[PDB]
Structures are given as C-alpha cells and as structure tokens.
Amino acid sequence: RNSIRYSELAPLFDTTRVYLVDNKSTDVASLNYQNDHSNFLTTVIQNNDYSPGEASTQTINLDDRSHWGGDLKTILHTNMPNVNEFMFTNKFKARVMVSRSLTKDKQVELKYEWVEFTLPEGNYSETMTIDLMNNAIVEHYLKVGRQNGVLESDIGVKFDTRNFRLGFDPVTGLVMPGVYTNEAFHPDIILLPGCGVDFTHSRLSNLLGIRKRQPFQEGFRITYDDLEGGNIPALLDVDAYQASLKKPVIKPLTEDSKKRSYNLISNDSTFTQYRSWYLAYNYGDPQTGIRSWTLLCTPDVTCGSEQVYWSLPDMMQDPVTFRSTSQISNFPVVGAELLPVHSKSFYNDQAVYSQLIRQFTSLTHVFNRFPENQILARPPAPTITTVSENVPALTDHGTLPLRNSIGGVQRVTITDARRRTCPYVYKALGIVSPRVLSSR
Amino acid sequence: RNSIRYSELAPLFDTTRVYLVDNKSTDVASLNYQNDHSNFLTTVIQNNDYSPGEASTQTINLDDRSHWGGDLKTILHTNMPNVNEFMFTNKFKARVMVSRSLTKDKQVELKYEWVEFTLPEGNYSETMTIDLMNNAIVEHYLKVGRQNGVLESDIGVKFDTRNFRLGFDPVTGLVMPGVYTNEAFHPDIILLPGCGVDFTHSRLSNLLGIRKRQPFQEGFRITYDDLEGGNIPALLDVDAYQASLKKPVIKPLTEDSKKRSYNLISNDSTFTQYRSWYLAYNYGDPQTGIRSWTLLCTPDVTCGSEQVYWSLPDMMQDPVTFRSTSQISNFPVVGAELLPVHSKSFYNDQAVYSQLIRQFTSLTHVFNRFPENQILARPPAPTITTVSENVPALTDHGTLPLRNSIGGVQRVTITDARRRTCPYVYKALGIVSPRVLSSR
Amino acid sequence: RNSIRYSELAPLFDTTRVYLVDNKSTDVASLNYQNDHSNFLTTVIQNNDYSPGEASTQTINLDDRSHWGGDLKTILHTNMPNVNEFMFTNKFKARVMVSRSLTKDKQVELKYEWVEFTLPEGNYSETMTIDLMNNAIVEHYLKVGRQNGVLESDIGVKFDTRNFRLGFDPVTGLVMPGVYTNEAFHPDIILLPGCGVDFTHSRLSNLLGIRKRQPFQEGFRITYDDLEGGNIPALLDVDAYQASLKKPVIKPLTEDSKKRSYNLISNDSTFTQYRSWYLAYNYGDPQTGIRSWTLLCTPDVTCGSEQVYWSLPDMMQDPVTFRSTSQISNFPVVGAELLPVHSKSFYNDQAVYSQLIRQFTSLTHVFNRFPENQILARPPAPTITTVSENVPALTDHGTLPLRNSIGGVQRVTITDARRRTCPYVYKALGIVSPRVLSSR
Amino acid sequence: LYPIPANATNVPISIPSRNWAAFRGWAFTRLKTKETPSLGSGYDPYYTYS
Amino acid sequence: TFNPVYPYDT
Amino acid sequence: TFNPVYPYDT
Amino acid sequence: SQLNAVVDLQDRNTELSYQLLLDSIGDRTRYFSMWNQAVDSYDPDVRIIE
C-alpha cells in the first residue's frame, strides 16, 4: 500500500530518509573528481558493501501504487568574496583624461578615453573598496596620465563620501571654513569636465549605493554632463580674509600647498569645475537633475542579494513547467534560496581619527597621495563600516514530488541567477524524507 | 481528480512549484522596462522554448474539479535610507525668528515665521540626524536671519539631548557647576519665546522619540507656549563666586566668551527664556504640562516600522472583501509584512570624548559653530547610537486560494501603507506551491 | 488500536515522550563510564524504582497493530577548539631550507627538505593562528637552520597578509614608498626559491582562505615554482633618491638595518626572489598562473563547516539503505546536523595600531623577530578578526520510524564526517515523541 | 516584427517546434524602424516621428 | 559687519 | 621632471 | 461578475485589422467626418512621374 523497498532488505513503511551528501570517502575518490561542491554526484545507497557505481545499479523503490513526495531541507555554506570576478565586482569602466597637450600653436588639446580598471579580488569593507577604486584610477594615471601631459590637478573621476557643501554660505558663495568639512555622509562620485563613469557591467554600483530608478533599462552611465547643478563650491581664502582684518572674502582659494589648481570655472565664479553626484541629487533641480533618474540608497557591501537554485534531476519530478534535460545549465529547479551572505555592521568612531592614525599605522600614504588637495584627498572613513560575511544557511524547501524509483547515484546541482555552477560553495548537502501523497 | 496540466507535457499530480521572479533575462528585456522591483511582470512559464509573451498565451491549469490553494513564501530585500523624501523623513517645519528691528522710535519689532527645512537624503545614525537638523536651522539663519537683524543670541529652536538641570541647586536657583553637565540623556527640542516646531508631516518626530499620547489626532505642533514650566535654569557665575571668596552666587552668568546673551527673563530671575521639552515632561506640572499629551519614548532611527502589502492579482483569488480591479493602487492584498529595516545598536563611549576629538577629526566646527554658548553648543553624542540597517526578509505567508488557470504572465506588486510602489526594493521574488483543498 | 503500554502502569494513548539524556545520576554511575557524550547508554525508563540494568529488561511497547514514528528534536552542544589535532588543524607540511654550505671549492650547496610543523591546540583567532604558523617555521630554523649555515636572509616560507605591490610604479619598477604598504588585505603565503608548502592533510588551508578550484583531487601542494609571475617587487632606496636631489631611483634597497639581503634576482632587476601567492592570483597570467587552479576565498576560522550524524540504533528503524550492525562506526544514521561552530566577527581598528602597541603590551617581539626586514616582518593584523565560537544547537530532525518495542536502555551516538565519536561534545540529549502512522 | 540592420540583406527567422493545426498562411511587408513606434509599453521615449 | 558664524579662533 | 606622485615630506 | 471580458495581446493588431475590415465592407474613398474616416493617400502623379 505504501512500502519502500530496497534490494534485499526488510521493507520499510511510511517514510524514511535518503541522504544527499558530498563528503562520502568512496564516491569522492571515484565519481566526482573534475566536479565541485555545486555540481556533484553522490550515492544515496549508504550501504557499506557494494562498490559505488555498482551501487549505481541498485535503486530505492517507493511503492508504486502511490505518488510520493519528500521534504527537502538543505544545508548550504559558501565563502564568496565581497569583491570578485565571477560576481562582477572586480571591474568597472570609467572615463579619464589620457593626454594634455600644447597643440597647433595656441590650442589646448584634451584627449579623454574610456577604460576598465580591475580590483584585486577579496578586499572587503566598503570604505576600503572605495579606496581600492580611487587607487585604480591613479594606478592608471601612473601608466598613462603623467607621461602624456595631464597633471594631477586635472585627474578626472574620484569616488569620495562627503558633503562638499556643509560650510557653504549663501552670500559668500564659498565654504567659509576654508576646508570641505571632513565628515562622511554617503558615497558619491566626483567628475571633472569631459569625463565620467559607467557600471553597465558591474555590481559595484550597488556598493556605492547609487541605483537607477528604472533598473531594467540596461545601461548605467553617469557622465559629467549629467551631474548638472551641483559643482563643488570653492573654499574661502581663510588666510587672506583673517590677516586682512572691505574684507578679502571674495577670495576663493585657487590652489593649495604643492600648488595644484582647483580648476575654477572662471576668475570670477565661486564654483569649481568639480561636479559631485551627491550634490546633484539633493541640491540640484529635483525635476530635471539626477535625482530624477537615480536613487540614493543604503550601501550594502554584498553588492546585491542574489539567489541560487537547487536541482536534483534524478530524484524529484520536474516542477510544473520545466522540461527534463541533460544540460547542466537548464536542469529543473526544485528550490530557490538566497545566496548565504550578510552585511554585518560595525562601529569605528576610530574612522577619520583612524584615517589620521591609519596613515601612520600603514607605513604609506598610498591611498592619500594628495594630502593637501581638498578634493583629491582621501575620503573620510564613515562610522559604521559594513562587511560581507559568509554564513551557513539551514534552509527548508517544501515537500516535492519524487520518482518512485530513486537511482543509486543522484546528481546535485546548485546554480546561480544566470544559471551556472557557483565556485564559492564549500558545503552543500540535503536530507530528503519521502512520504505518501495519494494513490494511482 | 487532482491533476496539474500544462500545454503538452506529462501531467503532474498533487503539487509542484510555480516561481515568481524578476531576474529572468528574457522578460526583463521585453516585458518590464518602465517598471521596477515592486511592480513588475514575470513569466511563470519557465520553459526555455517559446517567446515570452507567446508564453503569455499558455497557462498552468490546476485540475478543475478541485479548489486549489498555494503556500506563498517570499524573499524581500530593500535598502531604503534612514532619511529620505518618500518616507517623509527629510523635511520638517519649525518656526524661527526672521527679523529683529529698531522701529517707530522705541519699539523692538520681532517678526517670526514658519518655514520648512529639508535634509540631504541618506545620512543615518540618530545623533548625526539631529545635527543635520540643527544645521538646517542655521543654514536658514545664514540666508535670512543675520541679514535682517536677529543675532545668534536669539536663534529660536534647537534640538539638543541633555538634561539642562543636573547641576541645579534648589536654593541658589542655579546650575552651580557653571556648565550644563555635558552628558546625553534623550533628545529634546529647545525653544525661544515666540517660536516652535511642527512635525505634522514628518516621521522625524519618531526619531526624536517624542509622540502624541493620542496619535490619530493629526496635528503635531509643539509651541514655545506649550513647554510651560521648565525653562532651562541659568549658570552660576563660577568665576565671580570663587574669586569672591556674603558670596556673589546670586550672579547668574549673563553671557559667555564672544559675548552672547543667555536671554534671561529679567535682571533678577535665575531662569532663562530658553524652554526645554525634556524638562517640561518630567520637571513640569504632570497634570497640565506637556507630559499630559505627549510621550517620552525610545528613539528608533527607522522612524517607524511600516508595513508593505503584496498582491498577485493574476494568480490568487481575491481575499474576502477586496474587489478585483486593474488600478495598481488597489489590487487585492494577499500578504502583509513589515518593511525590512532594523535598528542595530552600538556602543561608542567614544561619544563626547569623540565629539571632542571628532571636531578635530572633521576639519571644521560646522555643527558646533557656537562652542561657547552653553545652549547653542553641539549636543553631546549619546553612548549607544542607532542606525537603520536593511536586511533581507525570508518571510512566509500562508496557503492562499489560487485560480484554476494560471496565466503565463503574472503581475507582482509590493505596496506600502499608503498604497504605492516602494522605490527602495532591490529584490522581490516568491515561491508558490499549490495543493488541493476540496472539490466542486 | 493505538495504545502505548509499559510494564504495569495505565496504558497511554496517541502519544507521549521518551527522553534520551546522559546526565541521569544512576546510569552514569553504572552504565557509561568508559564512554563519553558522543557514545553513551541511557535508560529511557525514567521510573524511580528498578535498578538500571534491571530497567534494561523492561520495554516501552507502542501498540503492535500500527507502524509508529517519532519526532526527534535534539540539543547538541560542543566546545571544540579552532585549532586542534582531531580536526586536523594543528599540523601542516612545508618545505624549508635546511643547510647552506660552502662546498667542493666553489659550489654553493643548498639543501631543502619537507617537514611537518605542529601548533599548540586551542589558540583561536585567524591572525594569531597565522603568527603561530610563522613562528613554527622559525622555531624549526632555531633547531636546524642556523646551525647548518642558512641565514635569516634566506628563510623559505612565510605567511603574510598584505599586497606587496601597492606602492609599485609601472616605470620605476619599484615600490616608491620604500616600504611595503603595511595594510592587511588577505592571507597569502610567500616563498623563496626551491621551497613551498603542502596542506594535503590539513584544514588550515581553509583558514588562509585558499582553496583548489577542483576540491576532490586530493593533493594540495603549492610550490615556489607554481607562484609564477608575481615575485614581490623591490623597494626604492628612499634615502639615496631624496638625498641625491639624473636621479638615483634605479637604486632598489638591497638590504636593511642589521643588513639582511632581500635576495634580488640579479644586480639589475627590480624584482626580488620572494614569490607571493596573492600576487600570482590577481597579478599573474590568469590563464596559466595560479588563479587557474586555486580560488581566493573568505577566510573562516572554523576551518570548514563539518557535519555530524546521529544514530539511535536501538530505537529507530534503520533508514532506507543502511543495514543494522553493531559496529559503532557504521550504525545507521537518523539525523544530520552541522557541527555547532560559528564565525563571530569583530572590529579592531586597533590592529596594526595595536601590533605597534601589542608588541610593547607583550613583553616580547616573539612574533616579530625581524622588525626591519620588510618581508620577514610581522604581518599586519587585519581589521575584522574572526573567532570560532561554540554555540548550543537546538536542532530538529523529522519524524522517524520507531520499533514497536523500545528497549529499556538505548544507545545514543554522535559521529562525524569520517565516522568516529567526537571528543568535543559536552552535552547531547534528545526528546522523542511517538505517534501513529498507519496500521498493519 | 524582426529587425533588419542597415545594409543587411539576409533575414533568417526561426520558430521553435510547435503546433500548426488550422494554420492559414503567411502575409508580410517591411517597415522602417523610425516609422514604427514601440508598442511594448505605454510610452516610447525614442519615438520622434509623426 | 559680517558674521561668518564660525569660531575661526579654535 | 618625474612625478613620483607621493608626498615624501610627511 | 467583476471578470474582465476583455483579454488582449501585444501580439494582436486591432488598428490595422479595422483598417482592413473597412476596405472589405465599403468604399474607403469616401469620407466620413464623424470617425475621422478619411483614408491616407497620395497623388498617383507624384508617386509615379509621367
């Protein structure tokens, strides 16, 4: 009526457990080899005698007269890096200045080009991720920039995280303090005329916390031109003003120590040519600015909760509309589950008291190369850093229909959103508990 | 009896799984486009052949002879900012002084007006949120205040967080220490004669931790006049008293460095014209004061746990009393769930040892502009800051009735309390598992 | 129809609870003795009279006319060390230099050999674990190295955690800063010509966060030869260059204080003979380098989520294909569960500001013995340390079939992946609740 | 509607195996992309023709 | 007669 | 005329 | 009934269908103001120069 028979052993009734597990010493040796914990074979047999493979011949038979089903809970555990190549978090296109030249007697010829910089897999934490990006902009300048004109003064594109506009005085037209108040509010990206960044093929966008208000329109390009209204205002010549006590004030600090120009639009304007995203969003025209088509969001280092799909092709019936095949990247799905990664949050009031000390701690100002320029400076570390953290996930799918004849060797397969094994799985295993559902 | 048929594939029995998911490469291209993760279409088909849309023609049929239902668990993930425009946490009305004038020979003409200040989306943490508010009060004074008389001495409205009354001596009538003990207890709002704040259209109220004891009476206005009994007492002239060793004591420090007046009611009284909410609550008349109609509550940065409603118009039967429509903002609801945001709490004994160091860390005293005035000073950072944090929510709704003919394309829709898509959704997807419930 | 009888007590119906517990005062005395919390006996009787053993005679009878089953939830609690012998985290083979000699008139005879170093069980935290390893490399040199030639200058194999390549200038061919920027990015292992490490029999590999892209091919050996492309570049002679202001630059610091050679390949090259894994991975040929067959992963101190299997040989029916035996290491399994260990993550911006202070805190530079050599130096402590932490696990297995005659003494057994009791169990106990499933 | 890139001369179309019972026949033309508003939506941002 | 509203001294 | 792009002074 | 009798497809072409339906049942050459029924045409002498 509801048996469960196996080769030659006492028949069992009503229910039991078949175990899908990678570890088994025997099968690892033989079976999987060129496989990994995301696409492997395993014997469900569990009987000490019998050579695996020869096991493959045997079968667990759930009484034929009834349609069976089984509860499938699984234990999935990864250890995927915040920033890696497979997830698309190690690359990102941006347009920078390539050459600054003296041409055809009087012309200033500026040549800009798009280029894709890559990051060294792993390096978690958001802030640091920013830094690694800024550094990659530089590392490039080091291989092309300088040796083709282009000064530091005109480095296009830099990810910062502050509100260049806190000091700002509605009359002066300047950041009175003479310094862009060094506190971190949200990541944003700053651009110089003519350049900009593109994330079309990168989840890092999600790390900065900047998304399109219309996601499905593939094409994340944020040009200098887009950051309308909201160019970082200029600094008051704190020195002049004070010593001068008319009043100098109108004097908008044009350079800095080591004399770098703050590219001011004209000898008059209080504004600089440096455009900030964060500004355009909440300080620019809400109806036509950038706030119109992009959204200011919480960072999230994981870069985006993605899901993984399970499949047990040789043991569960194929769900409603999937068709059975043998193409690993199209197997039927039997369970979906978010990919095991969380955002742990911490507190480091030590940030920026630490950037200050961190710089001495790290024997180099590698990230802060321009410790004077109020722009190109090293963005403030925000209190509350986030870090992707891997965690085992004791998930639980529902009862799923089973085949009344379970093969000795079952194939287990965890796929990702785009349907492809996921290299970062360290442990995957599931427990199935069959039971009756109705009869034929 | 209980089949589940599809186009031309083997019939399935008893149960299975239909998947509602946004990601699918095909549909994103075609279908949704002008949509977002809170109002999108998706094919439930899952069959590799067939052009989406042409998929739309097909249908999953749950045996007609029985009334089906399906378990609906979903995976929702957002990333909405502590402070943003859509949730109503970036604005807040307050009444400040606009002009101080010398008029009609002997009159002192004070003109006050209401004005709505806005904040720059994002900027989490409660303390900092306070600061951003105080700053907005200022930023306004900078554009209107000064250039119309009104000194700093008479800046109306400032959010602080301390107990101006710890030093207080029941005889002296003064805060003996000569300083308002710089420790943070709870946010409160201080007012000068004639001004005050209004939150009628803002959840920030909930951030300060001040609520009406009768919520539904739309209208949160807290006037200076309301903060009866409980005007910040004055400071002992620590210098005079000591040097003087009658005893000066009665001397209530009238100004401070950079000479700002502490607006004392009269040449006699030990009390200042500055009224504090926090005082009125526990130091004023309990029967008629403010403690009568407002409640001192725990902060909470999220500003208020709000819920979101799901709807699968084309797949579930319409719950008891909802009527079926096509107006996105009235679809039937099938599941309610709190909007994925938590209050992570941290410890920063570094607070106020940090405000002290934070000020040097941040190259500007942007928030502390009046580092002398014991009132207008920068509120102490409280130990234990809170920060809204986004978290994926693996929720689980119950079994819901299904239509016996499931369309190829289903429409998924997550709405909010007021019934409107929620821009801050990054991932939404659900799994439905149909099963029999009775027959016709 | 569905009784539950016991010796001579009123019959019970429908369900109840049998308790499997180690603690019992009586049985501990008699029964188990030479056993431990992972392989013990216990009386299910629970009746105050009756000598255990004599209890063993009695039996709980679940009505014969029906097939019973029981829900089995358990409470498991361990306290296993991050690094211990049983889990294979206290040993690890590496190949180091044994002797440096002056031979047969002009030959420099270098003799290398493999050797297995062990660690002192316990010592959690990842960073520190690294240190303990590096120290073991040394401790060996102290017993063989020096007293056979081999200088410190040529110590093969050292686990570090930084990106020897941040300073690097694409033109100079040197790390301009004159110092390998002292910040921690990921663990990696550095090798000198001729040597290398092997983890074939160790989970520490998983601690460093370096795994094979093809796990099942038993054999983790990472030779110097493998770390192709990606030898730690050399340091700029910061002193020479500066004082010299042609420009010295080309000068790649050959030694350091206490004069140790940085083994530079030749009097010309800017590269040193020191090869770094981390470099080869993301800085070397992606198609043939090491990134081809190894994967950069998140650390994880636990060394690898392993599972444990339960078995109640004398109380549950033997699951589908297991056969009943009496060989403790083959009992049938009735429930699988991950071994109770998590990775708690912390923040210590105090790292490297602490290594700096930690060295004075610890009255010895035991781990930093070579505080000058930019290589052999003590790796930077990474912000965000991990620590294996034991946690009680209130797990829940499903309903499992029962024997209709439960013996007075049941045998409980928790096994591990390889099938062997696990010494680190402090508390194990389960609750079974039988109930009917069908009839005979 | 199947796209014909500028200068393209070959247009291959494929229809995955399906049912053809009651099929009546084919009818066809050629249109200019510029003169064909996109109907897979309530509004076509790229439609600049009247 | 312009208040920068900022304590430049300290 | 070579920019090391590094503030050696400090 | 609250059930929608209307069921459309992106795949259908209502406007065109109506254009063709009109031609089959009458003289598209005639104008009818009520429905803005005035077919698009061109001068034969312009399309083909004689």
From Swiss-Prot, chains A, B, C:
Keywords, ordered alphabetically: Capsid protein, Clathrin-mediated endocytosis of virus by host, Host nucleus, Host-virus interaction, Late protein, Phosphoprotein, T=25 icosahedral capsid protein, Viral attachment to host cell, Viral penetration into host cytoplasm, Virion, Virus endocytosis by host, Virus entry into host cell
Matches recorded under Gene3D superfamilies: adenovirus 2 penton base, domain 2 (3.90.1620.10), Penton protein, domain 1 (2.60.120.550)
Subcellular location(s) per record: Virion; Host nucleus
Main localization, broad class: virion
Pfam family, one: Adeno_Penton_B
Signal peptide feature range: none
Superkingdom, taxonomy of origin: Viruses
Modified residue annotations for Phosphoserine: S326
Disulfide bond annotation, renumbered to this chain: none
Subunit structure: Interacts with the fiber protein (via N-terminal tail region). Interacts with the capsid vertex protein; this interaction binds the penton base to neighboring peripentonal hexons. Interacts (via the cell attachment site RGD) with host heterodimer ITGAV-ITGB5; this interaction promotes virus internalization. Interacts with host WWP1 and WWP2.
Protein name: Penton protein
Protein species of origin: Human adenovirus C serotype 2
Curated annotation (Swiss-Prot), chain D:
Stimuli inducing this protein: Expressed in the late phase of the viral replicative cycle.
Shown stretch of the complete protein: 653 to 702 of 952
The protein's assembly and partners: Homotrimer. Interacts with the capsid vertex protein; this interaction binds the peripentonal hexons to the neighboring penton base. Interacts with the hexon-linking protein; this interaction tethers the hexons surrounding the penton to those situated in the central plate of the facet. Interacts with the hexon-interlacing protein; this interaction lashes the hexons together. Interacts with host dyneins DYNC1LI1 and DYNC1I2; this interaction might be involved in intracellular microtubule-dependent transport of incoming viral capsid.
Further information: All late proteins expressed from the major late promoter are produced by alternative splicing and alternative polyadenylation of the same gene giving rise to non-overlapping ORFs. A leader sequence is present in the N-terminus of all these mRNAs and is recognized by the viral shutoff protein to provide expression although conventional translation via ribosome scanning from the cap has been shut off in the host cell.
Subcellular location: Virion; Host nucleus
Gene from which the chain derives: L3
Family to which the UniProt record says this protein belongs: Belongs to the adenoviridae hexon protein family.
Protein name per its UniProtKB record: Hexon protein
Function as written in the Swiss-Prot or TrEMBL entry: Major capsid protein that self-associates to form 240 hexon trimers, each in the shape of a hexagon, building most of the pseudo T=25 capsid. Assembled into trimeric units with the help of the chaperone shutoff protein. Transported by pre-protein VI to the nucleus where it associates with other structural proteins to form an empty capsid. Might be involved, through its interaction with host dyneins, in the intracellular microtubule-dependent transport of incoming viral capsid to the nucleus.
